[model samples]
Target: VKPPRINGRVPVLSAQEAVNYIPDEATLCVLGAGGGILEATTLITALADKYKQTQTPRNLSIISPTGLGDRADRGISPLAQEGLVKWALCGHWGQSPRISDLAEQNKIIAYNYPQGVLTQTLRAAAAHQPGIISDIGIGTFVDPRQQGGKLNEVTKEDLIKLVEFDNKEYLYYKAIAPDIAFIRATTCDSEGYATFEDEVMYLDALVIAQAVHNNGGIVMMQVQKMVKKATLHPKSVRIPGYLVDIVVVDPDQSQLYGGAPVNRFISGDFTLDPLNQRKLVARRALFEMRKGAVGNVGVGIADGIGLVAREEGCADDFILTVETGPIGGITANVNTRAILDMTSQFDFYHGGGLDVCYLSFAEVDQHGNVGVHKFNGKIMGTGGFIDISATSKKIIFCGTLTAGSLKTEIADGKLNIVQEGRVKKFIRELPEITFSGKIALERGLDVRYITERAVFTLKEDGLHLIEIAPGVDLQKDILDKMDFTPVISPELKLMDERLFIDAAMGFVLPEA
Candidate 1:
């Protein structure tokens, strides 16, 4: 292979030393193509290893179509550990296991956007648009008003806001463009030619890479293996070698990464049983919410839910749970996150009753309207957000803060706010009303927001501030980080007082 030179026009010699060219605090766009098949594990591992070695970072604003990095390929988890991740704005949190624990400890500020909206943000980012415009966050806690693209853990201060602009209102979500892109492809040539055979939408990767390069950033690729010079076929090549800089090969890719593999678990392996499958998927999602840390496994926010149960000390008390999917008879089937059977799932989500309902939102406004449908030219059928958000006893949106390139840092156990989310949630109005604030307030239902940074509660007057991530700024950092105003609570705080103690001492010694 002809070696890449120092001309800045050359693809580097290898993925390992390429960082010497990546600028500090660079905005990086990573592509997480559904199936774990396309996660750029090798590249992330390389990046993480570099940071640990120097303790100095090429701080990145990681942008992904569907949030990147699942544990199996995590060298990137170390970046989260070091808090080098300024902001992780993502669509799904399922792959968040490795970093979830760090989050529980207030080590990072994460946020979740609905699956559709996240994809749109990339479209927006790639299009040179300012913010992904939509009605997603208009009327729910996910809006800047109540929670600001947050999740379950509660804290002091607010990081999102609902603002008025012109005669219309739109959630002013942060904006991000790529300075670097981390991607994985099926193969690459001796000259760095790359392709994507195991996935869909190869162009998105190409578009992002080109955009980042246009802005003078880097594009990194990880593939299963490198091929001989120019032996590549056109149909197999998705991203051309000229577009990629570094190529890292992860051993894990030899196996399935994410989405449906149709064999290992979700397919006919259905127990061939739905009940067992639901439990496994639920357990998988819950596990995704863990910190992936040796000390705090099963001790973070989601785990806190488990802890809440454990606190009750009932080895088998059957605590209530909610989800966006049907685990029928289990009581808390929010059924808002997944689509069980396109028809039944919609039937339940449009207006079903469940004990607890956990849902995902595309966006929320100060008024609290929610949007769940992906922008696939039509709705994913309001699958569960509508029914669950309306009927569930309690509703929680588990996601993160910004949806593009951002990172954070930790020093002496305190969070140092380096970069702020470029996205905004402050909007004047919403395009649709999936989850109505009027309905929520009228029903007197309990609503909460959880993210890497903080959490919030919705009340009569406005969005109430409840907690803040440790070491995060209350006003200048958290509040000012947003584009809207918050009903800063008189009772400002960290997560549970229990969390503080449990976190400091590591998790309560797991019962034998």
Candidate 2:
């Protein structure tokens, strides 16, 4: 496997000449993420078998700042279940539910931005610019009077507006050249650079192949093999073959999904388990993480706080990041993306640089509003969970106060529910609102929710409960499994019994 030529020859092609550089209504762009399929999916299954046999790229407008798949049947839902995507901007659609069931049957035009505002709007269209305003996402839901980043009812245009830069408030995001770019790699040398050598996240593949080769368009890469041109050095080239025009290779490329099993702790090819009540709500949400802080950690039971901070090395005194742009490593449970220092993860989450994040809640109401996208009906879209809970400054929100067959067990030290979860994640409102405990209590921030026995906190006067695990039962397990009432803290405490002991609740690391 040592042939990669370039101007010295073979830039290889033939997935029907790489779906003939995607034509009809193009705007394609794609990189990868979503439970590891670190997709290229054999060049998106040969452009969905060239649009299911020569329908020839009809009306495709794809774009994907991570949401490439595992919303059932592997990334981009096989060209979004056949209609060949006529519009689908992303940041997370909770792993593609057949393109959010074709944007809830309106048929498509879906939008949802905020995966670092489309990765800083493709680094501002590869620095030429035509978009990217910022202030991240003012007062949540991609503002523009909320829902401006429309997700359905045939998505009516207005991609995101509301201006005013200095006197605060922002959200513009326009830039989008993508006439095609599929990206993905593991190595590609012979002058066509492109090296990642077993990737899991280096995706941005040189910022969507230099913003589709600086707008003139067409990039295509995929690879898994093909070395030999200067035998690779210059810090292992991340993408330097004249912005690459095409290069296919395949060679059994399956590192992150669809029959996955190629571990390394998710290609970093190596990694394990245990913990109940989602590891006791990710071990009481890492005791509200401290020691050098700077967290983000969201993705079910808060990725079990990266295996209890890599078994108590306390993630070497904090600084983790991931919204698929790794900063510090160890965060590897479910859907894997750990391969550190991969492009600043949206310049450290659009600058407010997280000080605490830990999220998961699939619904929370009594005013501490939070819903991991949508609930009781479903949409689950918001991926970076509202830009890391609106630019973190403290937020915890783990899950399980009821969610289908929910059983529990910790033993004598504390906690025990043994089967009792038929949905009711502290509800009484939130039909949708990906986190906005009234804008984190009008930006005074510091929210919390934890749960496995109870912990709630968000207050401006709602959802206060405050702690309560030791053999729980604040009225048959947290006020009869919640629906509305929550303000219990008359100094309520009790949770720490070393987080219901299974062993190491020992998390020291902080002498900074």
Candidate 3:
């Protein structure tokens, strides 16, 4: 391997030296996801260690379009030290409990923005744009009428503003350029050109570097290996050398959190068998999928829809996309080739390209507002939920009817709730609104909440119970569990009996 050098200067520096470049009170933009895709763990850990030992870089602000940590530790969790991070603007927080704990405790000023908006803000900042104007957060908690994306009481400044444009409403998200950036790639040449050939996705790496560089700030890049100049094809160079200032090589960089150094399946080297798992909620959501439709699947129970598609041999009938940029071809467990960069993918999503989307909901109130970001005193910041849900023509919120110790069984072509869950998901009110029901109704979008026991649709007035599973009493299993009663449809029907059975239901896409 050659030393990453150009113009008689080796931009490659030791992690210790890289930490010295970051100054106190400087804002930082890091490129990575919660699961550690393209995360600069080596660089981040080095900075955290340096801060712990010397406490030199204090009162710093951090920006991450996605949560950058394993659920336990790693990623941004190390920077959770008090005085180390004074401000945080992140897209998700569930994976970084340590950092989010500080936000929850009001120790740090925090703001949770939609993942797509945050990523696009980087691009907007790179071009010296004032801010991003979109309808993504108009009716959600990010709206100024609501929390304005502020997480804690200490967060006073309004980062989101509700403005009217062309006689319509839009949320203007203020852009804060980073003073420094930490981005990762598979390889970097002596000239600083980089490639992500071995990573799961190109998640805002180039945009982050460009955003920092255009602002006259330092761009520290981490790469697994140093390659010879011009060794990488020009088309493959995701980040230009001129935009990069420093290069730190970490030979042992793992592709994903707690994952191998490299997984061919995730890098598009080959295909893998997406194991079939049948879930009742996923099966009912499949009925909404249409042939030739471009759809997206969110993390959690909704992810099962992709597997169900494969299991039913209809995976190719429609294209499935992950918000992290993997388009089509078995997006199970976030292990798929990234066909588009994160910024471009969100561009399409923000433009209302998705026909349907399936996402998990932590809670849905009687008014039909969906809450997935914060619940149970935990700050699970909205990732791409708002971006996908707002634009998709049809949205399906899939999850169990109840949570926590809920037990159920399927036999004799019917369903049985052996035990009730302690927590009821359908509540009278939500602590925070992540997806606004009123907005969906105004847009006339097809929205449905699917649970194992029953199915409900958003009506002009409120939630209307539409379908119920077999062998489950509506009064006991459904109405009694919810905090508020829903309007039962006069034509309430039973779910397909095949969904309760173990065998495939011979799923097929509706005619295009």
Candidate 4:
């Protein structure tokens, strides 16, 4: 064992020494989430961005429940794709496509362990447990018959195997915490209190931090803003700044690191009209799709939640929409929160527990994958992207063709696109697969990708443009901007005529 070291701006020793806390070839652990879901990508990116410049730490064993929710063949480091991340202990390849690509390509020693098991194992590390035990992978990839989470393609062994124990089939497994951990937090004061307005009290890194400190290692945080050194609220504090060993001020913290999608929650004095409200339907649909099937409701242009809740028709689902929490508080008919866990009090989002999900998109490739993740190097923590989109059984992706400095008006009970932004969500190939095309297929999930100008669905092979928003030309606008030719549906129809007619009448028209 060795003593942990700390470094910062004044004591800076190039990018190399700043994060050299991990010894060369030291067995290490990293915390991961599917993309921005419980993601520490800010820290991961900061390290990778720096390491890419320095090439520090030749080899290590990386452990995480999941890593880089980005799609196949993509990550800040691209190590797994480049064959640098060998011998990884992680859970849920479905959530992270790049790591899965590395697994399939036989580039590294990858293991597909249960997510909760790995998380609890770190918890056990903090609690001085010899090791954690589990039966999750008994019949799946983690089974020893399957090589116990090892990624060795040459053996051509079965993915899962069976054996007899005590005359009956039983499973055995063991795990250990890493000598070092990659933990990202929002901010740390001089006293070491970390806080981020995210979905968790500590982004699943608290116990891991305690374990690392107890084991004489270090904890690091990438933050956007730092509060007063001593005045941080104990409740306002998610991760105690005390546990953080080092702090890196990532300039792109909120969009790239900070969690919670409060953009829609941002208040303003935009004119609200009943008829043209659907022009902003993207947010409404996105909100509805990210809730539970049982008691879940929908949210709209800051106010469309009521309409979605009424339309979702579920009277009793736990809801933490952009506007409110639990739309139908404790309704007898709404016993839907069991698995959808939508309370701000606990693991608010079961992180993929929603029965259905929807999201606002800036652009979407022909594959029905939308680009709501990043813009200008800044990322908005995938907000509900990881929890709802990944977790929901059925998902609805909605957005407008272009947004930014735009406005519209309904005349004679008809809607209009008043302002035009730039580009289109429906593209040929996305900037990156923020969502995994491979895993989405495996899960048999349902996705309805809709835009003010077009509507689409995610298919087994690719995206199928289903309908077009009216008042837009295909060849002149859509086909012109797209990188790939879309599998355009001949039956591509315009938005429901009623949506416009109702807009003209001020939310007082026929039903869709």
Backbone clash count, each prediction separately: 73, 13, 0, 31
| CA lDDT of each prediction against the hidden true structure | 0.50, 0.75, 0.86, 0.49
CA-only RMSD, every prediction: 16.2, 18.4, 2.6, 11.1
Candidate order by TM-score, decreasing, is 3, 4, 1, 2
Scored by lDDT, the top model is: 3
Candidate that beats the other on lDDT, 1 or 2, i.e. the better one: 2
Q: In candidate 1, what residue range of length 10 has the lowest lDDT sum?
A: 290-299
For residues 1-512, write the lDDT of model 2, one tens digit per residue: 12345467446775567876677788887788876545777788888888888777787888888787766866777787555787888888768687778777778888888776787787788878889787666655667687777866778888788888568767787877787888877778755787775676685678788888788787878787778876887786878877886788888787766555455555554443455778878877877787888787877777868678777677767766777765565533333434543336666665667888887877788988786666656676787777778767888888888888787888667777878888778878775566678766777878888888888887787988888888877998778778888878889889888778878867675454
lDDT by residue for model 3 over 28-131, one digit each (tens)? 99899867788888888999999899987999999988987777678799999889999999999888889999999999999988999999998999999989
Would you give me the overall lDDT of model 4? 0.49
lDDT for position 282 in model 4: 33
In candidate 4, which residue ranges exceed 4 Å CA deviation? 1-16, 37-43, 49-55, 72-77, 81-83, 94-98, 145-147, 154-172, 198-202, 256-310, 315-512
Off by over 4 Å in 3: 1-10, 271-278, 331-338
Q: On a 0 to 1 TM-score scale, where does candidate 2 land against the true structure?
A: 0.35
lDDT of each residue in 1-512, candidate 4, tens digit only = 32234532211122234456666655556654434533445455545654567666566666665445555443333544242455665544434556555556666665554454455566667777765443334433345643455544533433234456557653433546566666655565655676654322233667667767666676655555565566776775666655666665654544323344322111111222244545446332533332334222332232354453444453223343321122233221122222111123113333444555555565566555554434433322233343344445766765555556556664553446666556444566655444554456566778776555556667776777776655667776456656667677767776555444543212221121
Writing each residue's lDDT as its tens digit, candidate 1 over 1-512 gives 12363443334345676555566777766665333434666566667777778765644565544434443334245456464666555544434445544444455555555444454455566567766554444565456765566643433335344556677665655445678887766667766777654432242566566656566666777776776767888765656667676666543463345333324222111232211211211222232222221111110223334433344343133322222122312111111122231223323333434434445544555765555432212222232244346545556654444434445554343444467656544343555455776767776777765554566677877567677767666777656655556688888776433332222222232322
